[PDB]
Amino acid sequence: PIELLPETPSQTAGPYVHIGLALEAAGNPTRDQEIWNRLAKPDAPGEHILLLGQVYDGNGHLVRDSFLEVWQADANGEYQDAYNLENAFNSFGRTATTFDAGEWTLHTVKPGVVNNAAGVPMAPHINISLFARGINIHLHTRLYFDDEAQANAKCPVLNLIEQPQRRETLIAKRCEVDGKTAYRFDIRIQGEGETVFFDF
């Protein structure tokens, strides 16, 4: 058959990924420009929301060195690819859980609807890539919203998961932290309640 050049294989981000990728969360000095957890400036268009979660290993214990990267459409369903700290909204962001902060946080806006390649609308989501020591190749997952029950029911992506109980692990539960709208989204790498992880 036809063989192309092989992709460079993956390796674990290791324990101190933060020193290279989350300068602040590592407690080291930062540079002038850093890629971080604040996707939307306060005046950007859309419903502003706070996102939070913990990450668990297979024995129920908290993963405190994980690193996460997010990609989402803005409030009109458009991916903003030109990353610039001046922009009111970037579609890309990074966050982390640390020894001090067992919980990660992201400040963005609720994404709008995008279509899959056959033109069917997908429910609003957030693409998440998870890296950490012990994870040899990163885990891709998607964060959906409990208050978008109707569109979640028809998402052609959520529908590819055979078992109805497993689609619930991708649904983030609405709450309020200081009069501000927040969704909680915990990730269980392994075991009871294992979050669904994708391949593409």
Partner: protein, 238 residues
């Protein structure tokens, strides 16, 4: 905004390391037991960030100067350079390469690192760079040292540099480790042995490059990275 015009060659999950590789002890509790769910590529997976307007500091690629508290880091001065192409052999321009590493004695500048080799007051350990039109990137740094870790009772990581590369989409993002040609610690590390195929291990190894060295100054290593092949869509939805 970003448009859905590409498709990426599916990853070969027997080439990359599996999630469960028991000799690397931390992988036991941090590997999914359910099968990954395959999904078609949509605009959510085929686009990603472009870091062209990120504002880079002038020494962000130069580890000998970007930390600096009075002088030079101690250790073997080296240039690590290469090119980023996709599996079809096409340069990947303007992409983000980040790297981080230990100092010459294997100590990392992080609070939880308690290995007894001292910190180097003039070394930070971090760089970033954007590949050029041709897919070339370069860093100047000191060769790191190997260090011990609590895995087996006498396990030592070979000297290595971590790499994180963006590529054109979130489907191509990859974090890996570079290793140095000839280091006898390479075939004994359980993290490197998470890769089942030996020809895949070989791709992680930077070769000494005396053509790029600066005489009377520093050596050079070459490490080319291959991201997933990218192609235009054809015959979709008919």
């Amino acid at each position: 905004p970003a448009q859905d015009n590409s498709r990426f060659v599916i990853r070969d999950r027997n080439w990359h390391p599996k999630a469960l590789t028991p000799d690397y002890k931390t992988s036991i509790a941090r590997s999914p037991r359910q099968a990954l769910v395959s999904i078609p590529q949509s605009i959510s997976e085929t686009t990603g960030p472009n870091f062209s307007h990120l504002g880079f500091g002038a020494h962000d690629h130069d580890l000998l100067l970007n930390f600096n508290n009075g002088g030079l880091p101690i250790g073997e001065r080296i240039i690590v350079a290469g090119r980023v192409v996709d599996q079809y052999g096409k340069p990947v321009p303007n992409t983000l390469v980040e790297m981080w590493q230990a100092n010459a004695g294997g100590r990392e500048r992080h609070k939880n690192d308690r290995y007894l080799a001292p910190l180097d007051p003039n070394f930070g350990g971090v760089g970033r760079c954007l590949t050029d039109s041709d897919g070339y990137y370069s860093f100047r740094t000191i060769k790191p040292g190997p260090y011990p870790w609590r895995n087996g009772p006498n396990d030592w990581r070979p000297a290595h540099i971590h790499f994180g590369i963006s590529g054109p989409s979130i489907a191509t993002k990859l974090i890996t480790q570079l290793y140095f040609e000839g280091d006898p610690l390479i075939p004994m590390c359980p993290i490197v042995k998470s890769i089942a195929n030996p020809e895949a291990v070989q791709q992680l190894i930077a070769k000494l490059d005396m053509n790029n060295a600066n005489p009377m100054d520093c050596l050079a290593y070459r490490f080319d990275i291959v991201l997933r092949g990218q192609r235009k869509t054809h015959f979709e939805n008919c």
